[PDB]
């Protein structure tokens, strides 16, 4: 299926990067460093409520890794999950892979379809991993989407 490539930067202008083999971190990168950041691949998912948000799946470009949400250790958790390079991406992704892209201004927010009210969020500090938060204080849930290719 068609997959649009983008790069995300939280509202504080922090670019996202892949560090631990299966972990995303957000930090401040200048124009000389905005090339080492992750390019996501967004595709539409047919198991949709629509509502007013667009359901999408977010994988990393070129890799068989997708962001998914799971109930782990008594708390919803964002995780980078590997999948069969043959079956993915599929038109009707499993619910844990689904995010509802919501647009407010020029900012986008990604709510977990599985865990409503939980968003892909970043902390105020640098080098902290991107997580599934619920929007509280030092939690940045608004992102900018730069179209890559």
Tell which residue, 58, 109, 112, has the closest CA to residue 83.
58
CA–CA gap between residue 94 and residue 112 (Å, rounded) = 12
Q: Are 122 and 130 in contact (CB under 8 A)?
A: yes
Q: What is the DSSP string of 16-29?
A: EEE-STT-EEEE--
Say which residue the tokens 């038109």 belong to.
91
Q: Are 135 and 123 in contact (CB under 8 A)?
A: no
Q: Are 14 and 120 in contact (CB under 8 A)?
A: no
Structural domain including 133 reads 1-149
CA–CA gap between residue 119 and residue 131 (Å, rounded) = 8
How many independent structural domains does the chain possess? 1
Extract the tokens encoding 91: 């038109």
Tell which residue, 47, 45, 58, 70, has the closest CA to residue 108.
58
Beta pairing, strands 139-140 & 108-112: unpaired
What method did the depositors use to determine the structure?
Answer: X-ray
Tell which residue, 113, 121, 56, has the closest CA to residue 89.
56
Residue 5: other Cβ atoms inside 10 A:
14
Extract the tokens encoding 14: 């922090």
Resolution of the experimentally solved model in angstroms: 2.8
What secondary structure letter does DSSP report for 104? S
Tell me, what CATH number does 145's domain have?
A: 2.80.10.50
User: How far separated are the first and last CA of the chain, in Å rounded?
Assistant: 15
């Amino acid at each position: 299926i068609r997959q649009l490539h983008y790069r995300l930067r939280d509202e504080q202008q922090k670019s996202l990067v892949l560090s631990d083999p299966y972990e995303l971190k957000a930090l401040h990168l200048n124009g000389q460093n905005i090339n080492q950041q992750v390019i996501f691949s967004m595709s539409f998912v047919q198991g949709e409520p629509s509502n007013d948000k667009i359901p999408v799946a977010l994988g990393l470009k070129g890799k068989n890794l997708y962001l998914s949400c799971v109930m782990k250790d008594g708390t919803p958790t964002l995780q980078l999950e590997s999948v069969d390079p043959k079956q993915y991406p599929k038109k009707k992704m499993e619910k844990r892979f689904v995010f509802n892209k919501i647009e407010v201004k020029s900012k986008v927010e990604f709510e977990s379809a599985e865990f409503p009210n939980w968003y892909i969020s970043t902390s105020q500090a640098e080098h902290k991993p991107v997580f599934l938060g619920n929007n509280s204080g030092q939690d940045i849930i608004d992102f900018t989407m730069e179209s890559v290719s």
